[PDB]
Amino acid sequence: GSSRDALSLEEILRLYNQPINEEQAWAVCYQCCGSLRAAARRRQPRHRVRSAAQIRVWRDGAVTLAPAKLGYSQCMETEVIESLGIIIYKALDYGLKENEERELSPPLEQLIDHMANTVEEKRKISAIRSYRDVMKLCAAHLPTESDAPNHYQAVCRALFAETMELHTFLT
């Protein structure tokens, strides 16, 4: 392997040969939504997350979506959030048998149910309309919500460092 500054979530899963943990799921969600919110503000077009290969985790803890007011366009925020929600659940389910299901903490399960529009605060949360809505739910996972920006960067920084050693050195 050769050392670089980003790995895809697909590569991360392949290297681990196991699913991501719950804290990593919250972190990728928060960090990727932050990147997407900023990209939209700078008028880069929205597009959907088609697969885990498109999600890039960086050395400094950033998470971005690789390339292919603006409130309405050919790709709405909720569509991007849905596609991200589905990919995050696949990452949490990675390698499990079809007849097994992971027992997620209720607030993480709820976040994902609402991201993915699979819903059929203790019963149901307000519908997610924006990247900021998702980020606020991830911040709420923490006892002190103002810790979120630093915390979720630190989570992805560690995930990168840990998998980069497998990337560089696994044969």
């Binding site: 196991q18 659940y89 389910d93 299901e101 992971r102 399960e109 149910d113 993915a116 699979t118 059929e120």
Partner: peptide, 21 residues
């Protein structure tokens, strides 16, 4: 890290997400 798993429920989140592929 997966650790804790249950049997797949017929109406649960895994069930619903699988049908969106």
């Amino acid at each position: 890290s997966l650790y804790k798993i249950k049997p797949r429920h017929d109406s649960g989140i895994k069930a619903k997400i699988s049908m969106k592929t």
